[PDB]
Design a protein around this ligand. Structure first.
Ligand SMILES: Cc1nc(C2CC2)nc2sc(C(=O)O)c(C)c12
Lengths: 273, 9
């Protein structure tokens, strides 16, 4: 019974991911997000343990679910005649990182450092669990404004992580790497690092660097805001044109710009409260 | 200049 376990609230958003409603779990008043995905729009399917056929997004969410709060938690799911319904946790109060950057403009590097670090830990967790998100962007990052904790959301473009080449992609093009633009080929980790460089530029400059294919492949990073030389170096390294020239996640988190990160609670008290 | 969201796909 789906309509009896959850009280449904207003629409939160709709788009390529489906339609997402605010909700509350009746048993304990837990805030949830209720995501509807039409069966005809699901590209990749998977099988659970019991071999029940579910969208791959359900498989990936189950693989990353745990106590670690940096990724969205799938609480339950249901199958309907023409759709699947996913019950996801909902931070409250919350703002996504796209709206946050729109309202605040370019972020102080201390705050960008804290946010970027948490995103790296969340993406490391995905990869540790065998999951490639493929749509890292500010729109897909929720800020818990009380706790200062970030959550990676919308695994609808994701895939099982593999070490061979990917030749399909349905994430966000302005965060996709030049090898995808040029050759329709990418490898998972180095493509994720590219999207992280786009994200870090977005945080410290107030918008993404590239809008057009020619800029993505062009190899020039112009800084529209004052950014420290250390931060610029890390961004330009993540945005190396050759995938093998990009840093690993270890090299990103050992980068000099990344040291002395704020704790999440400190981040909320200094920058969010 | 115009900052905007970008849909997936
Ligand atoms: C549109 C949306 N709004 C929100 C509001 C912050 C509650 N949460 C999610 S979680 C999600 C997903 O696919 O995991 C999506 C697409 C949303």
């Amino acid at each position: 019974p789906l309509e009896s376990q959850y009280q449904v609230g207003p629409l939160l958003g709709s788009g390529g991911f489906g339609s997402v409603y605010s909700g509350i779990r009746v048993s304990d008043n837990l805030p949830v997000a209720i995501k509807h995905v039409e069966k005809d729009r699901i590209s990749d399917w998977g099988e659970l343990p019991n071999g029940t056929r579910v969208p791959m997004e359900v498989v990936l969410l189950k693989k990353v679910s745990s106590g670690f709060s940096g990724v969205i938690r799938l609480l339950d799911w249901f199958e309907r005649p023409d759709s699947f319904v996913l019950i996801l946790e909902r931070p409250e109060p919350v703002q996504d990182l796209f709206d946050f950057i729109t309202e605040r403009g370019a972020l102080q590097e201390e705050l960008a450092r804290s946010f970027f670090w948490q995103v790296l830990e969340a993406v490391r967790h995905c990869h540790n669990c065998g999951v490639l998100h493929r749509d890292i962007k500010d729109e897909n990052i929720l800020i818990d404004l009380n706790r200062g904790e970030l959550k990676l959301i919308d695994f609808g473009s994701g895939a099982l992580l593999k070490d061979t080449v990917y030749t399909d992609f349905d994430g966000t093009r302005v965060y996709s790497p030049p090898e995808w633009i040029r050759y329709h080929r990418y490898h998972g980790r180095s493509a994720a690092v590219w999207s992280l460089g786009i994200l870090l530029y977005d945080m410290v400059c107030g918008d993404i660097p590239f809008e057009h294919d020619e800029e993505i492949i062009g190899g020039q990073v112009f800084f529209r805001q004052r950014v420290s030389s250390e931060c610029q170096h890390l961004i330009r390294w993540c945005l190396a044109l050759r995938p093998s020239d990009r840093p690993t996640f270890e090299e990103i988190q050992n980068h000099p710009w990344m040291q002395d990160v704020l704790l999440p609670q400190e981040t909320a008290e200094i920058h969010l409260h | 200049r115009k900052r905007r969201r970008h849909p997936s796909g």
